[PDB]
């Protein structure tokens, strides 16, 4: 994808719908390449602004997120064919071609995608926070407010699943396995800390407190 807008649309939706793929690749590879391209195209003076605008496109207000997920919008055709292809590939893999497709395939797919997109939104936010030098805010605690709300949704989702009892069923169970990137603990240890702790360390610390205790 030559056009940067198409590149990031492609990578955001590949990251979301392509559920077996680590988010570490979205961060260390996709976001970095996009940022480079903006650096080159817009110049070192002013690229942060354009980079931010490109990311912000995929940022979901808490109201928009609730609609996307309560009404299972992710099952529906996207008018953009780049996003839509990734949706279809996900459905082909987990709802059409899987022999065990059953009565709880859809609900599990929707919760795996919801858990996954919460993480993606936290990532977008952390990236924007770093760009705008907003980390100091997390010393003693609106993008910062938005991060906070998504962290609430992350751990509530986690608790909801934990309070409850096909290959999508394994992905769902991975959300609560600490050894996996799909879990909050894994998302902290394999993504947040390695790729965000050097910039944004106060935000990372805040995330750890919010999601796990003070320890």
Any overview of this molecule?
This protein has one domain (1-215): Methane Monooxygenase Hydroxylase, Chain G, domain 1 (Up-down Bundle), CATH 1.20.58.2130. Helix content is 69%, strand content 0%. It has helices at 4-17, 23-42, 47-56, 62-70, 81-96, 105-131, 143-162, 167-174, 184-196, 201-211. Helix 1 runs parallel beside helix 5 (81-96), helix 1 crosses helix 6 and helix 2 runs parallel beside helix 9. It starts with a helix and ends with a helix. Keywords: Cell cycle, DNA replication, Nucleus. This is DNA replication regulator SLD3.
- Tally of domains: 1
Query: Within the CATH hierarchy, at the fold level, what is the topology?
Result: Methane Monooxygenase Hydroxylase, Chain G, domain 1
Compute the number of strand runs: 0
Taken from the alpha-carbon principal axes, the silhouette is globular
* Total of helices: 10
Any idea of the CATH class?
Mainly Alpha
Ends: how far apart? Answer: 44 Å
Roughly how many Å is the radius of gyration? Answer: 17 Å
PDB class: replication regulator
Keywords: replication regulator, CDC45-binding, alpha helical
Assembly: monomeric
Entry title: Crystal Structure of the Sld3/Treslin domain from yeast Sld3
Topology:
Layout: H1 4-17, H2 23-42, H3 47-56, H4 62-70, H5 81-96, H6 105-131, H7 143-162, H8 167-174, H9 184-196, H10 201-211
Subunit structure: Interacts with CDC45 and SLD7.
Organism: Saccharomyces cerevisiae (strain ATCC 204508 / S288c) (Baker's yeast)
Function: Required for loading and maintenance of stable association of CDC45 with chromatin during initiation and elongation of DNA replication. Also involved in temporal regulation of origin firing. Required for the association of PSF1 with origins.
């Amino acid at each position: 994808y030559s056009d940067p807008k198409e590149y990031i649309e492609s990578k955001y939706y590949d990251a979301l719908f392509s559920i077996h793929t680590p988010l570490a690749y979205f961060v260390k590879s996709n976001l970095v390449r996009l940022k480079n391209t903006c650096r080159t195209k817009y110049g070192s003076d002013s690229y942060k602004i354009a980079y931010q605008a490109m990311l912000q496109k995929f940022l979901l207000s808490i109201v928009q997120f609730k609609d996307r997920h309560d009404n299972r919008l992710l099952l529906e055709p996207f008018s953009s064919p780049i996003a839509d292809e990734k949706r279809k590939n996900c459905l082909t893999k987990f709802v059409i071609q899987d022999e065990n497709k059953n009565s709880s395939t859809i609900a599990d797919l929707c919760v795996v995608l919801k858990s996954r997109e919460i993480k993606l939104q936290i990532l977008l936010l952390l990236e924007i926070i770093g760009l705008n030098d907003l980390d100091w805010n997390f010393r003693d605690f609106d993008y910062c407010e938005q991060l906070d709300l998504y962290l609430d949704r992350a751990c509530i989702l986690d608790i909801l699943l934990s309070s409850e009892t096909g290959t999508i069923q394994e992905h769902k169970k991975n959300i609560l396995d600490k050894s996996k990137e799909a879990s909050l603990v894994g998302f902290i240890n394999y993504v947040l800390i390695p790729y965000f702790n050097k910039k944004v360390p106060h935000a990372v610390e805040f995330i750890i407190q919010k999601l796990k205790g003070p320890s």
